[PDB]
């Protein structure tokens, strides 16, 4: 299954280097800028790579919803995470001409009783989400737990 698509050559190369190091089989889709990898490893690998810093309405909505769902699924592969919800809020093509807008994301996680996300895991989530959405800076990702505690500084 596709690990990543639409990668820069630089990111692609970095991702391939990491996969080789981890001894994970991979197949870079020919001229598809995509890297199909073991289906059962896709989510774990996305997270791991994120930790290393790598890399119509209805459709949009659907797309957005699909993206949200995928991101949630990936985040749920983290050990301490029981469930995750991702909400993406990219304003519709800035109607206002002068004012400038920017995409943001809100991530809510339900943690396993007695478990917490560490700083690394938190950073991985933030990176994963930011990388998935064009123009979404890490700073515009808010990560909260079930109790509403802000995890991202």
């Amino acid at each position: 299954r596709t690990l990543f698509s639409n990668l820069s050559d630089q990111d692609g190369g970095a991702i391939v280097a990491q996969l080789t190091q981890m001894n994970i089989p991979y197949r870079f889709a020919n001229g598809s800028g995509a890297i199909e990898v073991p289906a059962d490893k896709v989510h774990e690998l996305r997270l791991r790579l994120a930790q290393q810093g790598l890399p119509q309405f209805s459709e949009q909505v659907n797309y957005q919803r699909a993206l949200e769902g995928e991101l949630a699924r990936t985040i749920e592969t983290l050990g301490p995470v029981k469930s995750a919800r991702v909400h993406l809020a990219m304003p519709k093509p800035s109607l206002f001409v002068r004012e400038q807008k920017s995409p943001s994301a809100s991530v809510t996680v339900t943690l396993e009783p007695g478990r917490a996300l560490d700083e690394g895991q938190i950073s991985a989530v933030v990176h994963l989400v930011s990388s998935a959405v064009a123009g979404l800076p890490p700073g515009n990702v808010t990560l909260v737990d079930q109790s509403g505690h802000l995890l991202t500084q």
């Binding site: 109790s147 509403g148 505690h149 802000l150």
Partner: peptide
């Protein structure tokens, strides 16, 4: 410049007070 920093400071304070209220009002 400085006004934006002050406004962000106010926004963070308000958000944290909001979260503290929500934390006890949730259970």
């Amino acid at each position: 410049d400085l006004n934006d920093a002050q406004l962000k400071f106010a926004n963070d304070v308000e958000s944290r007070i909001q979260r503290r209220i929500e934390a006890i009002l949730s259970p």
